[PDB]
Amino acid sequence: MQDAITAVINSADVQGKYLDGAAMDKLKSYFASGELRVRAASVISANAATIVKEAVAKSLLYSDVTRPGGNMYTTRRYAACIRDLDYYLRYATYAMLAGDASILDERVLNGLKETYNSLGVPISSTVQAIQAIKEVTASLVGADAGKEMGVYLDYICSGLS
Amino acid sequence: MQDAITAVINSADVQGKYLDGAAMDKLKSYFASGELRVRAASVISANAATIVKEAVAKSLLYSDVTRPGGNMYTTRRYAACIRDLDYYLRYATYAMLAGDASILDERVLNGLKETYNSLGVPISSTVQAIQAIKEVTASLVGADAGKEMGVYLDYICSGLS
Amino acid sequence: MQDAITAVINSADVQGKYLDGAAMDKLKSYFASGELRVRAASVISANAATIVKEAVAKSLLYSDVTRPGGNMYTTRRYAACIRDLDYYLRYATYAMLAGDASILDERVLNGLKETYNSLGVPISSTVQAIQAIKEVTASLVGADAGKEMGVYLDYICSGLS
Amino acid sequence: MQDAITAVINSADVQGKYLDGAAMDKLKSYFASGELRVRAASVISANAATIVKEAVAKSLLYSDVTRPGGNMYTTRRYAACIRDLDYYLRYATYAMLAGDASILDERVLNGLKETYNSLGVPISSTVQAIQAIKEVTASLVGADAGKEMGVYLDYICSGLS
Amino acid sequence: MQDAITAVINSADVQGKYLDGAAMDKLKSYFASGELRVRAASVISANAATIVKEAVAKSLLYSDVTRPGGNMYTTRRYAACIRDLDYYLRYATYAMLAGDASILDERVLNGLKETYNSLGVPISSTVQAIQAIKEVTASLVGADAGKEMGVYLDYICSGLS
Amino acid sequence: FGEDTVPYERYLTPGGLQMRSARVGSLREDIGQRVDKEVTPRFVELGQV
Amino acid sequence: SIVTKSIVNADAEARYLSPGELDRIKAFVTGGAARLRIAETLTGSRETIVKQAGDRLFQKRPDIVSPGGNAYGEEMTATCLRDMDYYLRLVTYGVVSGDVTPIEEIGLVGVREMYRSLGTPIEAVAQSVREMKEVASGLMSSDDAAEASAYFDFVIGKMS
Amino acid sequence: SIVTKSIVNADAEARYLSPGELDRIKAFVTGGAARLRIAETLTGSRETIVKQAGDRLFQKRPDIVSPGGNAYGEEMTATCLRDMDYYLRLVTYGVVSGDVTPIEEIGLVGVREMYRSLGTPIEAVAQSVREMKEVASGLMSSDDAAEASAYFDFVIGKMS
Amino acid sequence: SIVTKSIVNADAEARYLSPGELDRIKAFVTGGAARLRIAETLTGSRETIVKQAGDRLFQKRPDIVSPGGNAYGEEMTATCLRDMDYYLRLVTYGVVSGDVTPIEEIGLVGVREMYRSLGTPIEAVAQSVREMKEVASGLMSSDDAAEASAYFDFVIGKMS
Amino acid sequence: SIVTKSIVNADAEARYLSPGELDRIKAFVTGGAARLRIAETLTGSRETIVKQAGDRLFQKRPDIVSPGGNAYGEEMTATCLRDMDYYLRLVTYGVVSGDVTPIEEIGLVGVREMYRSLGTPIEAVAQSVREMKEVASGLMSSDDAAEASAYFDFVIGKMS
Amino acid sequence: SIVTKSIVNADAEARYLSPGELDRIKAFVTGGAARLRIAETLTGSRETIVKQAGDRLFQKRPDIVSPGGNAYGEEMTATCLRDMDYYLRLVTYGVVSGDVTPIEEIGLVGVREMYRSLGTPIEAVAQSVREMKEVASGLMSSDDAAEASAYFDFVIGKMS
Ligand SMILES: *[C@@H](C)[C@H]1/C(=C/c2[nH]c(/C=C3N=C(/C=C4\NC(=O)C(CC)=C4C)C(C)=C\3CCC(=O)O)c(CCC(=O)O)c2C)NC(=O)[C@@H]1C
Ligand SMILES: *[C@H](C)[C@H]1/C(=C/c2[nH]c(/C=C3N=C(/C=C4\NC(=O)C(CC)=C4C)C(C)=C\3CCC(=O)O)c(CCC(=O)O)c2C)NC(=O)[C@@H]1C
Ligand SMILES: *[C@H](C)[C@H]1/C(=C/c2[nH]c(/C=C3N=C(/C=C4\NC(=O)C(CC)=C4C)C(C)=C\3CCC(=O)O)c(CCC(=O)O)c2C)NC(=O)[C@@H]1C
Ligand SMILES: *[C@H](C)[C@H]1/C(=C/c2[nH]c(/C=C3N=C(/C=C4\NC(=O)C(CC)=C4C)C(C)=C\3CCC(=O)O)c(CCC(=O)O)c2C)NC(=O)[C@@H]1C
Ligand SMILES: *[C@H](C)[C@H]1/C(=C/c2[nH]c(/C=C3N=C(/C=C4\NC(=O)C(CC)=C4C)C(C)=C\3CCC(=O)O)c(CCC(=O)O)c2C)NC(=O)[C@@H]1C
Ligand SMILES: CCC1=C(C)/C(=C/C2=NC(=C\c3[nH]c(/C=C4\NC(=O)[C@H](C)[C@H]4CC)c(C)c3CCC(=O)O)/C(CCC(=O)O)=C2C)NC1=O
């Protein structure tokens, strides 16, 4: 995986040049936003379960999917759906801390669409669930870091689509 | 698609021999059932729209599916649901006439889960709609021919599973 | 695709409600911004190719991308990249006129990242070219309308990166 | 392991002879007792958590071993101790269903004493804890199977002491 | 393993008491010596290979062990010996950064005496090598950091002997 | 198409439609999500004069 | 909307929008205040239009609410008035959008098949929409009535 | 501790400490005076914090002291306050050590099995230590409360 | 970086990052200006350090430029100075990253096999990086010299 | 089912079905009529079992239905009765199948995680299943009550 | 307002305002920005305060929403939450005005007689405003929480 530091290092390295100020300002901006990322990650790590709880309550509960015949009908499939949303929230927290969406398409997205197509998982329903996660964590954390979290959540949705 | 006759001819043809006595017994069993199959197909083909009307009134109407926010709300989606139930009734009649579910495996269940997941179609609600079709058809035609229709309707349901 | 009016109408339809006060406020805001959207669309439709040609002069020319071994080396590949930036500018103009990114998601970003990964197109260089388009359009159009165009071009950057 | 029914089979295997009456009557006694053994095993399987809870409550609770300075003070030590008690109850259930203590001699009494000496686990505390296991099981089932449970628990006492 | 702060925290937890001055004096001593330990570890990691080569030059070269028939003759054996020596140096650096020698007497001295007695490695010659390492580090990093290294190094000597 | 009609995209694969309409934009609120009819609360309605 | 229609046409042509289409969007943007006024009047008087037009419908076509009719009963009459309120809401959507596109997307495609499956007379639904048009045209100003009558007569023509 | 986790990472990768983690240990050493100051004020207020937090806990959830709760009786409430005192001691231990490792290896893993065998509501004791962190953040200064609240919220997350 | 290390370790343990790593991350974030300053100092003196250290290496050990040597030839010495520029660039990468992972992932894995193939003496490469360390430490301030020489001795320790 | 377990146990050691498995399957077949009778009276009395057991549950545990509780409100009460009907249906499935693996595969894997996400007290759900056990055991003969209470007590053990 | 109090005192004395009183409006003017910030915080967080305070009030006093209670129905519960919204608006008025005069003049004179006529438990109204104070102090900073809780405690003292 790559964070913003390794991203700008490899961007300098692929052209083989040293660090210029047009690259050093990227590291300065990342160190400006780092404490915001750390505090938002601490809030999300403290409140990881309740984000998923109110997200499923906002989006997936009392819908077609929990009814008999739905994809999250049995308790095994419900626990698998909660596990998937925990995966999405934790890896989006990782991407928010890194400041680069490399871990998302390098450890979540590279085959998950094929896996969901083989399992019959509703990708649009998972996208709506991740949007519910985004609204809950935006209300919980704040607008400034919630936007950065929502960028990687929409990255996860775009990889899923 | 394969009926019982083409299934017997296929099983003899891949052996390269003619029809032996067990093949004759299977054909005579199918010819014995063919009277009931033709009568049930005639009754369903006559009262095709009434079965869909009764099933939609039984299972889908005056619910959140047909209310605003549901997937049967917009009238193009309502007419699409009517067309889908006519699809299920007509291909279940085809599978009853054939005595085999290969027609459902080839044209009905071919990516239907992926299609409904991409569209956002409620799998649980359409399974309940096919169940209402099964109950209305079993009420209309009888116990034995209704059970014969219900075998392929439950096959469509388990394909949607 | 949807514009701002179509998005408001769709939200009110999904709620099953008439146009309340807040929906009329959003409609009045869009009707207020429509003058600036029309003027910006006319200015960009005038200076369509000019934005692209100093954008590639600012971002892409005289680099290893243009030099042999680069992805924009041949005249065919150069015309392909010029056409791609023309499409990006035209669709950002469409999104700025509509007030929504629905056309960007429907007709640009669907499979665009997979297309560029299959072709080997540099994502970072393409993003920097779109940033050059954003800077030239902001310098040429104005402040608020240039900021709106920058918002939709950054949406294209977020969907592509 | 080997059961009570297989015990006479193994003894006759060593002797190289068939079943004799001094083992026939023991096998008939096991056949007469086996229904109350299997039902008492079913009862303690249904109420298995209550035995561990009451044993911890009336033997190990509010003691030197669970106060600071004790070998069962910390939460990890408590979880390990209740897991050990649950395993003791499950293997005692296995023996009282099976009619033999070979399951305890092989799958419990292999090196448990030496691991407890390695860990510094209080042997006398475990011995009074399995006395509490005896009292709770005898209260739950009754003395008719309580003495039968106490035979294998006294086997545990002799093995661990 | 157990460093200084976890050691005093465990000593407090055995008595079940909050941290008082009788451990906080040693805690202030550790935090006063911490930057000395880090700078000494930096110097030792800077000169880590040179310490080993001067130690083997001043204690182990031109001896009966590196004569044929000795305990350091073959090339694999010499590589293993210098591997042991910079293992001892690096784990002594670990204990010197930690403030306690739990890592030294556990993850180095678990079975080191027994395996050296089985192999035939001269314990006295290894003690002389460790004393040579101690003299080189004391002459290279200073007096106070040198004797702090020497405490853990003759702790290693006492573990070997 | 007749002799005068340019061909046009008539049918899609489900995967292609999912790529087009399963992104963050251009996806409706009622596709795979329960839509709760939000309303002004009854106490706010009573508090309005 | 007409903005959506112009953007769709320009996208099909793969070009920027023609200045005639820019002037169309300009004219719609300037004239949207009157459209919002029409939609506000219909939204405010949504209940009396439905009630009076339902009464005029049931007097003109007594068969649909007599016993044996499709809308006989209080709950069936409530469902019929709910359908009329739905169509008036779609008329407000079309007035706001400036074109018949949301009306056709939400409530005209498959309407024939839907009402044929329900057994409801589509001609009587068209008569209900016609009475709603008459009551709304009586309730608003004449230029506003002429503007709303285009969308109303679109619904009439697509039902008939 | 953070020093022992640094050397665990170091000998897991089987080499000496990196300069970044050496400067990180330097930063931990320099901040350890502030963490020890937090330790002094917490061990000075070790009684009033746990007493006010227990009073807030019984005021929030009266069903604990009501019949049907686990902590019914004077010895039961004394053991509940003793558990809260142990967890406050663990939070002070973590503030001293610089990481959540002592809380994890003393009283935070296996707490589900602990309170399942006890019958104690895990959300109720999470609420109790939440009131502990609120009273602690009230009594601390802003930077000290911000430092201790991360470890407190880790206790909340792993004991919720 | 340390962010990448902590996220990778928490991912392998399938858990969120604890505050015991989050405080380390925010400390690395806050203490970045010194590393940035050392980075622009090194890339300002990127040429002269390479020139002086190459001059010192070829005067200290003339076997490199001896006939039959590995770098006998003007283009061979040019590629040797280019390798010195490469490792100075990697040292600047490690300085601006605050970690040894960029040097390890770019120019330390397979270096022994690479120079074992090419015949270039690995101890003379270590001497080259050591001489760059001495020139840079002479060129810059003493605490910054120690900070840069930390990564420099990491490189020469992985070399030998 | 028992047939499934016997075939799986034979196939795992790659042989045909043993005489012990044939005797077990024969016992399953002979007890099929009694098991079918138990399942038939359960599904015939499925409404009154859920009604009476829900009434007894809500009398014995008013906290889950009082305000602030998980099931407070008519919709949440109906959802709780729906969950009880779901578990009664799974009990009938287990009674038909002769073992506990349909109940395990449908409604007893991830049940703790699901109800923890829902906020529902799993011990109160176990109390609901215990009341269903008592009400259903009062509606049959003694051997039938014991046979059904075996599957009921399996659900009790999996919930608590 | 304190300017109204000082001008009433000066007018009843028939004189001009003393320099101490001019300092009263002076310091009131200086504190006006912070008072407006507190009132704007409450106004922005209006509905959340009322909903959480209502839920916690109904949790602590289940009898008022039980059948036979004063607020059993949904409309009566809405009247409860409406009274709460009234008192929250009065608290914001008092925060803006800098004194308890608008709260007392609008909704605290004759409140006992009004709620006795309505059959409403005045102590449960006091508990409801106490829960409102708790939620406001939860989502407000501590000094501003004390500033709002002064007016909240005035309301509680007038109810009790
Ligand atoms: C001369 C052209 C080259 C050279 C040689 C050189 N070697 C040493 C010292 C030692 N070499 C060994 C190696 C071995 N001993 C063994 O028994 C075996 C396997 C059979 C090997 C490979 C050892 C152990 C030493 C240390 C002396 C000892 O034996 O105790 C030196 C001396 C260096 C010193 O500092 O004393 C020298 C000079 N050096 C070169 O540059 C030429 C390539
Ligand atoms: C060198 C100081 C003296 C010497 C020693 C000698 N060592 C070996 C090989 C081994 N060294 C170790 C030690 C460790 N392995 C670990 O993982 C750790 C913890 C970090 C330690 C301390 C071990 C276990 C061996 C055994 C085999 C191996 O290579 O791993 C040998 C070789 C024995 C053989 O020939 O089989 C020798 C001789 N001998 C001397 O004379 C030096 C004074
Ligand atoms: C009233 C003018 C006429 C009439 C109406 C009538 N309609 C129904 C039933 C339904 N009609 C619809 C149609 C729509 N749903 C939509 O979302 C829209 C566009 C916004 C339309 C037009 C639907 C879905 C139903 C089903 C009701 C449900 O929600 O489940 C009935 C009831 C028929 C029945 O058998 O229940 C009636 C009576 N009937 C007349 O005679 C008038 C001509
Ligand atoms: C108080 C916040 C809540 C609660 C308390 C309660 N505690 C007990 C008794 C025990 N609690 C523990 C737990 C620990 N001991 C440790 O050393 C540690 C780690 C530091 C923990 C987490 C233990 C072991 C006991 C048993 C006492 C003993 O050591 O023998 C009880 C009594 C249980 C009973 O049934 O008697 C209670 C009630 N309950 C609540 O409702 C409060 C929310
Ligand atoms: C009743 C005994 C207890 C209780 C119940 C309660 N349940 C819910 C909500 C849900 N429960 C489930 C669980 C299942 N779905 C299945 O398909 C199966 C197995 C067949 C199970 C066990 C689900 C999915 C829901 C969500 C509703 C939905 O259909 O989407 C609630 C509501 C909680 C909420 O926040 O909505 C309640 C109250 N509560 C009690 O107090 C009793 C102990
Ligand atoms: C192998 C196929 C191939 C072609 C054809 C090619 C063309 C090419 N010509 C360029 C520029 C240019 N080309 C010219 C050349 C000319 N101006 C004139 O007036 C003369 C008429 C004419 C040449 C006879 C100039 C002046 C520029 C620079 C334009 C600018 O920078 O504004 C550039 C951009 C500069 C760059 O390389 O980064 C490219 C890519 N590249 C390729 O890989």
PDB file of C-alpha atoms and ligand atoms in Angstrom, chain C residues 57 60-63 65-68 72-75 78, ligand 6:
ATOM      1  CA  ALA C  57       1.017  22.970 -22.999  1.00  0.00           C
ATOM      2  CA  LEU C  60       1.739  17.437 -20.785  1.00  0.00           C
ATOM      3  CA  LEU C  61       4.123  18.856 -23.405  1.00  0.00           C
ATOM      4  CA  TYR C  62       7.935  18.683 -23.088  1.00  0.00           C
ATOM      5  CA  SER C  63       7.949  15.650 -20.803  1.00  0.00           C
ATOM      6  CA  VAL C  65       4.839  11.437 -21.681  1.00  0.00           C
ATOM      7  CA  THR C  66       5.413  13.179 -25.022  1.00  0.00           C
ATOM      8  CA  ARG C  67       8.881  11.663 -25.464  1.00  0.00           C
ATOM      9  CA  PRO C  68       9.304   8.073 -26.784  1.00  0.00           C
ATOM     10  CA  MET C  72       1.153  10.006 -25.420  1.00  0.00           C
ATOM     11  CA  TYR C  73       3.908   9.486 -27.986  1.00  0.00           C
ATOM     12  CA  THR C  74       2.432   8.839 -31.448  1.00  0.00           C
ATOM     13  CA  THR C  75       0.205  11.246 -33.354  1.00  0.00           C
ATOM     14  CA  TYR C  78      -1.815  12.469 -29.099  1.00  0.00           C
TER      15      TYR C  78
HETATM   16  C1  LIG L   6       6.849  10.601 -34.571  1.00  0.00           C
HETATM   17  C2  LIG L   6       5.542  11.383 -34.704  1.00  0.00           C
HETATM   18  C3  LIG L   6       5.515  12.529 -33.756  1.00  0.00           C
HETATM   19  C4  LIG L   6       5.194  13.854 -34.144  1.00  0.00           C
HETATM   20  C5  LIG L   6       4.856  14.260 -35.538  1.00  0.00           C
HETATM   21  C6  LIG L   6       5.269  14.677 -32.961  1.00  0.00           C
HETATM   22  C7  LIG L   6       5.005  16.087 -32.942  1.00  0.00           C
HETATM   23  C8  LIG L   6       5.074  17.137 -31.955  1.00  0.00           C
HETATM   24  N1  LIG L   6       5.396  18.446 -32.307  1.00  0.00           N
HETATM   25  C9  LIG L   6       5.377  19.238 -31.183  1.00  0.00           C
HETATM   26  C10 LIG L   6       5.645  20.607 -31.117  1.00  0.00           C
HETATM   27  C11 LIG L   6       6.142  21.471 -32.082  1.00  0.00           C
HETATM   28  N2  LIG L   6       6.446  21.167 -33.379  1.00  0.00           N
HETATM   29  C12 LIG L   6       6.919  22.312 -33.974  1.00  0.00           C
HETATM   30  C13 LIG L   6       7.300  22.301 -35.324  1.00  0.00           C
HETATM   31  C14 LIG L   6       6.893  23.084 -36.411  1.00  0.00           C
HETATM   32  N3  LIG L   6       6.435  24.421 -36.326  1.00  0.00           N
HETATM   33  C15 LIG L   6       6.503  24.999 -37.514  1.00  0.00           C
HETATM   34  O1  LIG L   6       6.164  26.151 -37.755  1.00  0.00           O
HETATM   35  C16 LIG L   6       7.032  24.077 -38.604  1.00  0.00           C
HETATM   36  C17 LIG L   6       6.022  24.307 -39.736  1.00  0.00           C
HETATM   37  C18 LIG L   6       6.903  22.726 -37.857  1.00  0.00           C
HETATM   38  C19 LIG L   6       7.910  21.560 -38.197  1.00  0.00           C
HETATM   39  C20 LIG L   6       8.298  21.456 -39.690  1.00  0.00           C
HETATM   40  C21 LIG L   6       6.905  23.394 -32.994  1.00  0.00           C
HETATM   41  C22 LIG L   6       7.307  24.826 -33.099  1.00  0.00           C
HETATM   42  C23 LIG L   6       6.423  22.841 -31.818  1.00  0.00           C
HETATM   43  C24 LIG L   6       6.229  23.573 -30.535  1.00  0.00           C
HETATM   44  C25 LIG L   6       4.854  24.260 -30.373  1.00  0.00           C
HETATM   45  C26 LIG L   6       4.770  24.927 -28.978  1.00  0.00           C
HETATM   46  O2  LIG L   6       5.526  24.513 -28.025  1.00  0.00           O
HETATM   47  O3  LIG L   6       3.929  25.874 -28.848  1.00  0.00           O
HETATM   48  C27 LIG L   6       5.034  18.439 -30.069  1.00  0.00           C
HETATM   49  C28 LIG L   6       4.889  18.868 -28.647  1.00  0.00           C
HETATM   50  C29 LIG L   6       6.314  19.058 -28.008  1.00  0.00           C
HETATM   51  C30 LIG L   6       6.729  17.813 -27.256  1.00  0.00           C
HETATM   52  O4  LIG L   6       7.230  16.870 -27.947  1.00  0.00           O
HETATM   53  O5  LIG L   6       6.569  17.760 -26.001  1.00  0.00           O
HETATM   54  C31 LIG L   6       4.836  17.121 -30.550  1.00  0.00           C
HETATM   55  C32 LIG L   6       4.451  15.989 -29.651  1.00  0.00           C
HETATM   56  N4  LIG L   6       5.637  13.830 -31.868  1.00  0.00           N
HETATM   57  C33 LIG L   6       5.788  12.564 -32.277  1.00  0.00           C
HETATM   58  O6  LIG L   6       6.116  11.630 -31.503  1.00  0.00           O
END
